[PDB]
Description:
A hairpin with a 2-residue loop joins strand 8 (about 285-290) and strand 9 (about 290-295). By secondary structure, this protein is of the alpha/beta class. Strands 2-3-6-1-7 form a five-stranded parallel beta sheet, with helices on one face. Strands 4-5 form a two-stranded antiparallel ribbon. A two-stranded antiparallel sheet has the order 8-9. It has helices spanning about 15-30, 50-60, 75-80, 100-110, 145-150, 160-175, 180-190, 195-210, 220-230, 240-250, 260-265, 270-280, 295-300, and strands at about 40, 65, 90-95, 115-120, 120-125, 130-135, 150-155, 285-290, 290-295. It starts with 14 loop residues before the first helix and ends in a 10-residue tail after the last helix. The chain has three domains: about 1-160, no CATH class; about 160-235, no CATH class; about 235-310, no CATH class. The chain binds adenosine-5'-diphosphate (ADP). Adenosine-5'-diphosphate (ADP) binds near residues 11, 12, 50 and 167. This is Holliday junction branch migration complex subunit RuvB.
Amino acid sequence: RAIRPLKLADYIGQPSVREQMELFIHAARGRQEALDHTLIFGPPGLGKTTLANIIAQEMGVSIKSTSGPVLERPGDLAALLTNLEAGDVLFVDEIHRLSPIVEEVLYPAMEDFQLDIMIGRSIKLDLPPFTLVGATTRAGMLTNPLRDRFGIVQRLEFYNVEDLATIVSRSAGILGLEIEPQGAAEIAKRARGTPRIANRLLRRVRDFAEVRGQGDITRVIADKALNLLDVDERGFDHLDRRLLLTMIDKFDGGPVGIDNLAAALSEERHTIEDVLEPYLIQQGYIMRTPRGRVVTRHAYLHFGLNIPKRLG
Ligand SMILES: Nc1ncnc2c1ncn2[C@@H]1O[C@H](COP(=O)(O)OP(=O)(O)O)[C@@H](O)[C@H]1O
């Protein structure tokens, strides 16, 4: 009863990514080689970890999962690399958070299948072929050397509402739930472009339907459930609305720099930049400028506020 895709045939709504990865995986298997190192980037919840695990599943190999911050010293990486079997996937989430010195170990491992680490003497060791799968919230914060060493680069974008409905409908089928097409669309419309949120919202709407309705997912059941969850009709939660209202109230709409906003919210810089902003920017509620972030007129309109008429 698991809803996370395990094979590439169940990876809905990124047709270019799936058609490309199907091809490169089939070719690499055909040669009995490891897949070329693969970089997957885009906002969180889009399916980067999911895709990393599908790669290992379709290649028929093991995946060791790790993260940038988990690797404090070069030897932390070296121990993972020397425990890999030939063809295994080494998945490094948040790969941009590798310290500059730990990332230096990665260049010859990826390029030459060799480990070159200091201990002061340098030691050089042969590594078996393997696939480094890196993921990051967007590729621009990688160094040129690391970025250029990936042979395959996949870009994940926010999903459109029709593909989210398809994912919601498929998950409701796997969960054994009756769902009307308009119920799938109501969740999809308010799921913030993300399959992770759409699936989580489906699980909570199912609870509402089972305790308060008749067990099946309808548009009205979905709406009431999402209202109870405090997710509005654009998919904004309490933090999204607080971000916009802080910019409007405390900063007159902006421009406001990212440090000022993080302080005024008591959130970290990276959660604004990576978790909150990218959907709000894609949908036209916030703009970046060299002087800072500004809200657009659509942020005012969304809350039923008068649009200010001033000068910049
Ligand atoms: N293409 C897709 N089709 C269906 N479900 C997906 C897809 N991509 C991701 N998911 C779902 O989204 C959720 C989170 O995905 P994840 O791989 O953790 O995203 P990321 O690592 O990019 O934050 C999982 O429950 C998975 O079921």
